Design a protein around this ligand. Structure first.
Ligand SMILES: COc1c(O)cc2oc3cc(O)c(CC=C(C)C)c(O)c3c(=O)c2c1CC=C(C)C
Ligand SMILES: [Zn+2]
Ligand SMILES: [Zn+2]
Length: 162
């Protein structure tokens, strides 16, 4: 019981491009660019699609930086979140109806305005370290427990429908 998602962090040496959810679920919070991997598309096509739709950006390559599992109390189904980062982007960031991209200096990242797990794994992302992580949530604002480990290589899940 799981659902497959992507999260894309556009990360340059001094800055990170985040985006502000403009409405709907998670409105008011800054996040990486991502969403549900649909049926008929691969994980990496889904990551590129969500980045294109949300930021208007194209990337030459995505690096696999980590894997996050979300569990929610009252929901039996886990979120399987494949996390990517990209150094090299093409195009000018422009908002959609869903998301507005903005650049943040790396020491200025607005963790109080982001999802609570971000404070945990973002330091590893910024140190250029790969990670596996798990967060048990109660509601949107509360983490009940977590496990986060640095990994040498991101484990491959072999999803054969994606
Ligand atoms: C990756 O972006 C996040 C994130 O960091 C944490 C998230 O936490 C959530 C917490 C939740 O309770 C729920 C369930 C909603 C109810 C009120 C039952 C969640 O959907 C989430 C999140 O989706 C969430 C996200 C966004 C998901 C992506 C961009 C893969
Ligand atoms: Zn599927
Ligand atoms: Zn997976």
């Amino acid at each position: 019981a799981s659902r497959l998602y992507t999260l894309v962090l556009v990360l340059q040496p001094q800055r990170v491009l985040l985006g502000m959810k403009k409405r709907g679920f998670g409105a008011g919070r800054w996040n990486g660019f991502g969403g549900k991997v649909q049926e008929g598309e691969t994980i990496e096509d889904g990551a590129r699609r969500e980045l294109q739709e949300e930021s208007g950006l194209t990337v030459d390559a995505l690096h696999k930086v980590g894997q996050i599992v979300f569990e929610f109390v009252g929901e039996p189904e886990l979120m399987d979140v494949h996390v990517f980062c990209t150094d090299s982007i093409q195009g000018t960031p422009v908002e959609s109806d869903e998301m507005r991209p903005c650049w943040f200096q790396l020491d200025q990242i607005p963790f109080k305005d982001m999802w609570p797990d971000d404070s945990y794994w973002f330091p590893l992302l910024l140190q250029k370290k790969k990670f596996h992580g798990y967060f048990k949530f109660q509601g949107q604002d509360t983490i009940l427990d977590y496990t986060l480990r640095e990994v040498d290589t991101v484990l491959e899940h072999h999803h054969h429908h994606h």
